[PDB]
């Protein structure tokens, strides 16, 4: 079956600046600012753009050592990133693929909102565990705070 979860979290960073840091520089930024969430990021092939296969490793004592991601879309106009988790974790056992889309929309504040979508395609009768959804939500929030905070402490960065 295919099961959709959606969150939204707000940021005081302008959408255009957030997209640059959060999405376009995530390979460098993430293991830098959130080493408690992410210990490295390696591009197995590609730029970082559509077609890229990427390896994300997790710190010592996470449930899984690493996931592998396929980047499908990096829309610089509408501030969007589409990627699918194709290897690691429960992928190939309980899950077929997890496809994700992140979008950054400007708010009437001058800040922004991250809209996250996570589509789990399960194998057979296996059902998504609430703990997987919560850990994904939590991970998104730690990465987002850690980036926003870095941006506020380095005001000339990504303008």
From Swiss-Prot:
Subcellular localization, as worded in the UniProt entry: Cytoplasm
Substitution effect: residue 45 to S: Strongly reduced interaction with BV16, hypoallergenic
Residues that bind brassinolide: 54, 81, 83, 100
GO annotation, biological process: abscisic acid-activated signaling pathway; defense response
GO CC terms: cytoplasm; nucleus
InterPro entries: Bet_v_I/MLP (IPR000916), Bet_v_I_allergen (IPR024949), Plant_def-hormone_signal (IPR050279), START-like_dom_sf (IPR023393)
Function summary: May be a general steroid carrier protein.
Protein name according to UniProt: Major pollen allergen Bet v 1-A
Organism: Betula pendula
